[PDB]
């Protein structure tokens, strides 16, 4: 049984700084990619997807290409007040018709101090 753990309930950064959203998985099973979202539900915003998508503001804390990697923390650079919100670390599994969400973290609230 894999768990998605976000050790930070909330985070405060200044505008222009970097936001580090921490997330660790407890298992490699099941196989599947990790995705980051801002918000939950149907209209949630895709923040990161390790297999497809354009996310030039996001860098991974660790090397996700390593087979035994379980750190899925990301860094969002040049934070502005518009980046404030709740970010969820989500584990996906292989399914039909596309990848299917397996488990989501409890979320990390990002708040920003403006300039």
């Amino acid at each position, epitope marked *: 049984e894999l768990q998605v753990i976000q050790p930070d309930k909330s985070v405060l950064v200044a505008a222009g700084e970097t936001a580090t959203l921490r997330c660790t998985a407890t298992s490699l099973i099941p*196989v599947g990619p990790i995705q980051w979202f801002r918000g939950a539900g*149907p*209209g*949630r*915003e*895709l923040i990161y997807n*390790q*297999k*497809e*998508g*354009h996310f*030039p503001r996001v860098t991974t804390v660790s090397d*996700l*290409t390593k087979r035994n990697n379980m750190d899925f923390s990301i860094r969002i650079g040049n934070i502005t007040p518009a980046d404030a919100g709740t970010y969820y670390c989500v584990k996906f599994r*292989k399914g039909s*018709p*596309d990848d299917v969400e397996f488990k989501s973290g409890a979320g990390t609230e990002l708040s920003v101090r403006a300039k």
Partner: antibody
């Protein structure tokens, strides 16, 4: 730098088959989904499918299901697109893509007797 | 699959003219909406991602907007190098689809 190099133009007789190639550099295809797109002069861009080269899982648009077969080889860092029973409606430019901003230069496939 | 209707399919704008390209969806789409610029003889280039964010190298005169079932691409001041075909793209619903595209010419 990321780059996708596709195979040369192909001429296929109607009813026959062809396998297109796509070799990547600057990254390992094992780490990303590799997509295939076709573009016809009168039907625009159409997503054919993708493959996860890490486990070989393939997805397809229902239009190209029995028509397209996508394979990948992590050793040679190359993805392949096999097309069967090619009709004149399959004459198009076929693109290789790591989804987002990384595309191949395209491969012309003319289906004519 | 989602129908992305780009109308008009061909339009013209003079240098310095503000131009807006529209993309209407048969069903709702989310931040999976990309815009691709394509010129003859070249691959599609990612231009706008996640509705309003410019890809690297895209001039600041470009901007994107929209939500739900209607989106837009806008050039504040038309330039000659902006003459191309622009396709809107969604990949929030399976399978991912493209619009038929709007060809944009410069009115010299």
């Amino acid at each position: 730098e990321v780059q996708l190099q596709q195979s040369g133009a192909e001429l296929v007789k109607p009813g026959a088959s062809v396998k297109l190639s796509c070799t990547a550099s600057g990254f390992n295809i094992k780490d990303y989904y590799i997509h295939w797109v076709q573009q016809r002069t009168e039907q625009g861009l159409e997503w054919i499918g993708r493959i996860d080269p890490e486990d070989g899982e393939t997805k397809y648009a229902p239009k190209f299901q029995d028509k397209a077969t996508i394979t990948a080889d992590t050793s040679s860092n190359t993805a392949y697109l096999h097309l069967s029973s090619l009709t004149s409606e399959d004459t198009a430019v076929y693109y290789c893509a790591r989804w987002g901003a990384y595309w191949g230069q395209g491969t012309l496939v003319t289906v004519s007797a | 699959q989602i129908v992305l209707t780009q109308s008009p399919a061909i339009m013209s704008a003079s240098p310095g003219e503000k131009v807006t390209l529209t993309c209407a969806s048969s069903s709702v789409s989310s931040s999976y909406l990309y815009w691709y610029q394509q010129k003859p003889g070249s691959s599609p280039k990612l231009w706008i991602y996640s509705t309003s964010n410019l890809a690297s190298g895209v001039p600041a005169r470009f901007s994107g907007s929209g939500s739900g079932t209607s989106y837009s691409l806008t050039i504040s001041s038309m330039e000659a190098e902006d003459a191309a075909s622009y396709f809107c793209h969604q990949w929030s619903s399976y399978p991912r689809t493209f619009g038929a595209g709007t060809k944009l010419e410069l009115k010299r």
